[PDB]
A paper describes a structure:
It forms homotrimers protruding from the virus surface and, once engaged with the host-cell receptor–human [name], undergoes a substantial structural rearrangement to fuse the viral membrane with the host-cell membrane. The S protein is also the primary target of the humoral immune response during infection. A large number of [name]-[name]-2 neutralizing monoclonal antibodies bind S protein, especially its receptor-binding domain (RBD), providing a basis for vaccine development.
We determined four cryo-EM maps of the Beta S trimer engaged with [name], including Beta S-[name]-C1 (only RBD-1 up), S-[name]-[name] (RBD-1 and RBD-2 up), S-[name]-C2b (RBD-1 and RBD-3 up), and S-[name]-C3 (all three RBDs up), at 4.0-, 3.7-, 3.6-, and 3.6-Å resolution, respectively. Overall, the pattern of these structures is similar to that observed in the Kappa S-[name] complex. Similar to Kappa variant, [name] binding to Beta S also induces a pronounced S-trimer population shift, facilitating the transformation of the S-[name] complex to the more open [name]/C2b (64.0%) or fully open C3 (27.7%) states, beneficial for the shedding of S1 and subsequent transformation toward the postfusion state.
Numbering used by the authors:
A (entry chain B): 730 to 827, 848 to 1068
B (entry chain D): 689 to 729
C (entry chain D): 924 to 1161
D (entry chain B): 1117 to 1161
Write the structure that this text describes.
């Protein structure tokens, strides 16, 4: 998802001006097309959260007595003792992604709040994690079937061509390889804050677009002054309509330029959301034999994790 | 006597699946489901 | 036979009673209707000029004054026409992306059989039926979903002669008396045999292994011969 | 014989090597034949 923004045509072009409001009537429906375009973007931002984060309508929970066969899921699972529900990895994922909001809201640029809160995002993640752990591959194609986790790894190895005998013998070896690999994920995300840069580019793209949209107001656009109160208090009403029209045409093209760029960025974020919705279903819920999709190597299991304006996938493969 | 009410979004029915080492669940029955998808061309 | 025929009857009833399931196609008609109407309604706007009528400006104002007012009218219309074309190029990228998804499901779900999850629809995919639709296509997906479930007792391996017996196909289930072998997708209990399992490693390397007797189908048939052949050998001596 | 299957012959396959295919029924029956020889000697004794 991307930052939801709503820009009013009136206050952005000419605010607190009755004479300019009558000059806008000569340009017709330009507000309707620019407002519905920005409104349609904000609606699609919430649709990307329903198609990706929440796969199923049934919430799954973790049993109180944990015997997983030697794997430590405490880092991927949320901590109930914390005031905000999050895992040990999601604690870093939220912190490594970064007032400018209130400053831009003064010029008529409104930041719309998202429909799906981050706390509800962690619940959809914990529901998919607890389901993959307890139910294995069963909860996605139908009712949840109780299976011991030790036998779930046997079927996942039989799918990639590994006889389950390797599991029961290497059960202690696989336990050390998985727990050490998950520990490297938290150590890599803590030291390297640029691994989430794919999400930081989304925040930077919205920050540069909103700031440049405001910086266009300071330009005179070939007029005498960019301030509305100046033109009205300096040139006569018949002469003032010419200078105000210069600010209208420039700020209209500046607003249409922002809307055009946001409609283009909306197509790119929906393409990445459809890819995240595909990997959420095939890699996490089921087991995909596709190559270089669920990650390099023979795929086994996938663990989703909550991230700001996105989602992080933890892929376990057989190399 | 009806009006508009406000409430917190429900996240779905909470069902905790049992988990045990020696316990397993196998389906005793099945069904044939038909779904409809509409994709514009 | 009664499950599929009744399910198709539900599709006929859901399609006849609910006309909003096709709203995805109705949105395409609405986006075009709003786009065709907006473009023609902008012709009545003044676009910063005196009047939107071109015949009134030409027949009233002087040629030097008319060329200025008509210039604002033509330029304002071109910006409205470029806006229409720009919006059509954006909806073109969306409809081609949905067409590539429709061509992908048509190939994998309909032509062949796809094992992908949440692609051909919820459950294990079986067959997909395409249907013609205006400005689109409708897919009827037939899937396999389980219904009733029951909790069973399991175990990773069977210990018989001192070596672990791993199931060849399916999993081990028991009601608390005898251990049975059945598939994961359905319950069909079968007696544990040498053909249903295979010997790998020993009983110690398996965590949670249970002890039982693996039935050898050749054991009673060979023992019956040792009984018969000794009865023959006894007649050979008499 | 349980881990493999019989297809074609040795002349058609290019690069085939000669070896012995262990049949688990051979030593069980050959020892069973030796027991029958011991059983037959028990009925005569």
């Amino acid at each position: 998802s991307m930052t939801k923004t709503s820009v009013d045509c009136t206050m952005y072009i000419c605010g607190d001006s009755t004479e300019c409001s009558n000059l806008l009537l000569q340009y017709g429906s330009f507000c309707t097309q620019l407002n519905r375009a920005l409104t349609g973007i904000a609606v699609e931002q919430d649709k990307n959260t329903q198609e990706v984060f929440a796969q199923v309508k049934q919430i799954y929970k973790t049993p109180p007595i944990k015997d997983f066969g030697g794997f430590n899921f405490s880092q991927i699972l949320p901590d109930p003792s914390k005031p905000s529900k999050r895992s040990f990895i999601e604690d870093l994922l939220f912190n490594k992604v970064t007032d400018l909001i209130c400053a831009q809201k003064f010029n008529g640029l409104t930041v719309l709040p998202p429909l799906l809160t981050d706390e509800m995002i962690a619940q959809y993640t914990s529901a998919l994690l607890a389901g993959t752990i307890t139910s294995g591959w069963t909860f996605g194609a139908g009712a949840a079937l109780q299976i011991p986790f030790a036998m779930q790894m046997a079927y996942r190895f039989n799918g990639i061509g590994v006889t389950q005998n390797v599991l029961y013998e290497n059960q202690k070896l696989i336990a050390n390889q998985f727990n050490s690999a998950i520990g490297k994920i938290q150590d890599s995300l803590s030291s390297t804050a640029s691994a989430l840069g794919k999400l930081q580019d989304v925040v930077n793209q919205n920050a540069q677009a909103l700031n440049t949209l405001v910086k266009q107001l300071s330009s005179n656009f070939g007029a005498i002054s960019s301030v509305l109160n100046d033109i009205l208090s300096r040139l006569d009403p018949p002469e003032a309509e010419v200078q105000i029209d210069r600010l209208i045409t420039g700020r209209l093209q500046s607003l249409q330029t922002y809307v055009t760029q946001q409609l283009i960025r909306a197509a790119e974020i929906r393409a990445s959301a459809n890819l995240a919705a595909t990997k959420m279903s095939e890699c996490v819920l089921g087991q995909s034999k596709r190559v270089d999709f669920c990650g390099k190597g023979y795929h086994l299991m996938s663990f989703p994790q909550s991230a700001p304006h996105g989602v992080v996938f933890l892929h376990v493969t057989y190399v | 006597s009806q009006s508009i009410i406000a409430y917190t979004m429900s996240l779905g029915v909470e069902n905790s699946v049992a988990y045990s080492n020696n316990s397993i669940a196998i389906p005793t029955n099945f069904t044939i489901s038909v779904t409809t998808e509409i994709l514009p061309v | 036979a009664n499950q599929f025929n009744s399910a198709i009857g539900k599709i006929q009833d859901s399609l006849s009673s609910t006309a909003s399931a096709l709203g995805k196609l109705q949105d395409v008609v609405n986006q075009n209707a709003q786009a065709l109407n907006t473009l023609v309604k902008q012709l009545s706007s003044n676009f910063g000029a005196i009047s939107s009528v071109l015949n009134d400006i030409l027949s009233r104002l002087d040629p030097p004054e008319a060329e200025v007012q008509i210039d604002r009218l033509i330029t304002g219309r071109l910006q409205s026409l470029q806006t229409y074309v720009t919006q059509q190029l954006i909806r073109a990228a969306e409809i081609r992306a949905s067409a590539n998804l429709a061509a992908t499901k048509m190939s994998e779900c309909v032509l062949g059989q796809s094992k992908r999850v949440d692609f051909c629809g919820k459950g294990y995919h079986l067959m997909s039926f395409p249907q013609s639709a205006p400005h689109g296509v409708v897919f009827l997906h037939v899937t396999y979903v389980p219904a009733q479930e029951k909790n069973f007792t399991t175990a990773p391996a069977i210990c018989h002669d001192g070596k672990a017996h791993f199931p060849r196909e399916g999993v081990f289930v028991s009601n608390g008396t005898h251990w049975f072998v059945t598939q994961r997708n359905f319950y069909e209990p079968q007696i544990i045999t040498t053909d249903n399992t295979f010997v790998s490693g020993n009983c110690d390397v398996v965590i949670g292994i249970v002890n039982n007797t693996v039935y050898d189908p050749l054991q009673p048939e060979l023992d019956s011969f040792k009984e018969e052949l000794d009865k023959y050998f006894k007649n050979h001596t008499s």
